[PDB]
Symmetry: D2
Subunit: 208 residues, 4 copies
Amino acid sequence: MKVLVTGFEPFGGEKINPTERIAKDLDGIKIGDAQVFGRVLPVVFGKAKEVLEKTLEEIKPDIAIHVGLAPGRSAISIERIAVNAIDARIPDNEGKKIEDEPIVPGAPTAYFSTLPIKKIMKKLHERGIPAYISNSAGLYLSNYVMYLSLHHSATKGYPKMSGFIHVPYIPEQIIDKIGKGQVPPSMSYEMALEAVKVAIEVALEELL
Amino acid sequence: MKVLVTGFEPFGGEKINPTERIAKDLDGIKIGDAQVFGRVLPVVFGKAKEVLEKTLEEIKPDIAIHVGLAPGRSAISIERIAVNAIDARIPDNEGKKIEDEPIVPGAPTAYFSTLPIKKIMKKLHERGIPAYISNSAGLYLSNYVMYLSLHHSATKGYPKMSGFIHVPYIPEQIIDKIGKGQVPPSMSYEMALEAVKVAIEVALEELL
Amino acid sequence: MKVLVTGFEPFGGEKINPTERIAKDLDGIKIGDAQVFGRVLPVVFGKAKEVLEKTLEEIKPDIAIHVGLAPGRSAISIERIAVNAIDARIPDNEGKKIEDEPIVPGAPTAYFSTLPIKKIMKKLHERGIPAYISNSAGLYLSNYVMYLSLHHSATKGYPKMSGFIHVPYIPEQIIDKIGKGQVPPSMSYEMALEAVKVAIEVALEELL
Amino acid sequence: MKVLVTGFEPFGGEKINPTERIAKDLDGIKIGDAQVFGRVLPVVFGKAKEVLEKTLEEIKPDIAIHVGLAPGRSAISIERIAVNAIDARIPDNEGKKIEDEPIVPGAPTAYFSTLPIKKIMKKLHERGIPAYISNSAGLYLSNYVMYLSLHHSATKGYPKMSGFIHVPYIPEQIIDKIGKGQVPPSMSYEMALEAVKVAIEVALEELL
């Protein structure tokens, strides 16, 4: 059993992206006899797909859990659906701001996450971790990778399960926002990391 | 040197109030040679005043830092001003919903906090703790105690410094809110507790 | 040329649903030589489908614009996608709270709106009407009807264009919310109505 | 009977300030036999005080209702209190960003509005206009003028009644915000104007 967890590099002016640390922290760990691989993806259209594809083919994970930062969200959110579209509100890290364009021409308009999202949410709640099911992962890079991963599953037969989890800003990221006007919600790095670990455990247990 | 820190009991249907734990956790500790006293106040108009007054006269603190829960706020907030008015949006723990009534008839319309609020905010930020200055502590029990404490200072000469700090919900309090409709912001109990400790340290250092 | 505009009856405790009035106000009007039909749908799973299907077969509209109330949203929102799933956060008007269930078993996971959403948003902006593209119409009755309408189009060949528009609460609906805790955004009934009229005009102009 | 209504010029990058139009629209009108004067104030510390003082001495109004724009607020808000402090989050129109400074050295920490705020809120609600009582008018120019007006009343004996009303952005102001990231609440210009007219009527009726 192999699990692939991905995170993203910093973007949009942020000095850090907590999901990058999550990926690195989870890399190489083992839950039971399952091997976990953690990889960081660039916040760049095209390049992110290349890295994603290469990683999936290299590792051929049974389960893929892609993690991203969701500025403004107050709790852990588990994505229900990936949409075949790109409409960036801001440009990617290379200045590309793609609008009204499919991710995979001719492919399904959308794919439902194949992670046991309701069971994951339930377990997180039992752990005292606020979490909810999100019905839109946006149309930026998080949705982009979520869709490509699910399309890979539908087209290649692996990973068996694929999904996306968004985490709020961690506290330290709020500091310089205070003087700028508003104070967005945050969640400790420790809780975000544990949330992803829990999702992996629940997904694994689901695979018989 | 004596410091009085207060918190509140649960209210509004909540099973817990993190400030109650903060008060109990800080009771009896010492910062340098300063003695810290932690006391819990009832969320009841009148009774809260009685307890507050008795406590202040009993301990005669040099510094008073009153802490309360602020549902919905995303970061630590330091109150700038206490207003001479009661206008409860919800009733207190004994069903009393007082509206348009002064806290102390004839007394000043308001009192500015005498805690070094800007220095406290600055130190919290250096500690990676999101915090901002609030310009309204509401017109419920938090403001009620904040005003009475500052009035006591102006009238009795002690405490020399008095102020109020509001903390967000702690994560576990969000769990049953998720199914109810929305997901309010939260902040770990550990960070909330440390924030209050920092405020005490900064206040103490301020007193020469 | 025939246009069908639908709205919903009150739900979730609300005494009114502004989209019900919109449907009734637009019923029987004509834009150019196009005939507009306005119908109200029940906020009930199953029954809503029956009424929707009967209406579509009865009128056989070239364009279908389904309108709904979106509590909390601050501006007119044009739905980009309908998802093949039902996961009600609250029960429908008959107490049915369906969870994790497809709308049409075996049908596509999702359908993109076929209304010229970007052109509609652009025209609304020129009219000084705040509007944006929403990437999730929820998984309650609005999404339910949006999906069924688009599925009808894909399966029956009509309507040629189908989409969904959500409107904010109108001001009068905010009054009793004020004492309850928070003040959600609102938009005048007149602006919401005009927004729908504009969408119809833009859709019609699009059909050559 | 004379009523003075003031509004502010555009500020913070905005091309317009709806309160400027309100002031101009209400100037010269009469409610019963009461004369209404509408004047626009600059969003500049110091200069605003000069204009305010000159206007008050020139007209010597019985009632003064100062109106301002409150970006982000979702409904009409009636200010309960003016605070003797300046702490600008942004600079004024002349680049002055005053911090931690009293408005009037030695004067009271605060003044309660003398407008019949609860009756005004009640009437607005009866008119279907969402409105609530705000406990902080900020520490920028709105609070600055609110405080100076109330201080003038306490020191000069006129105006007999003085207060402040904040209005949300009007719809057209939201357009260019949409592409910038978030969609703040708005309220029609017509409703904002009527709200101020209602406040004047209620204030006048209050003066016997």
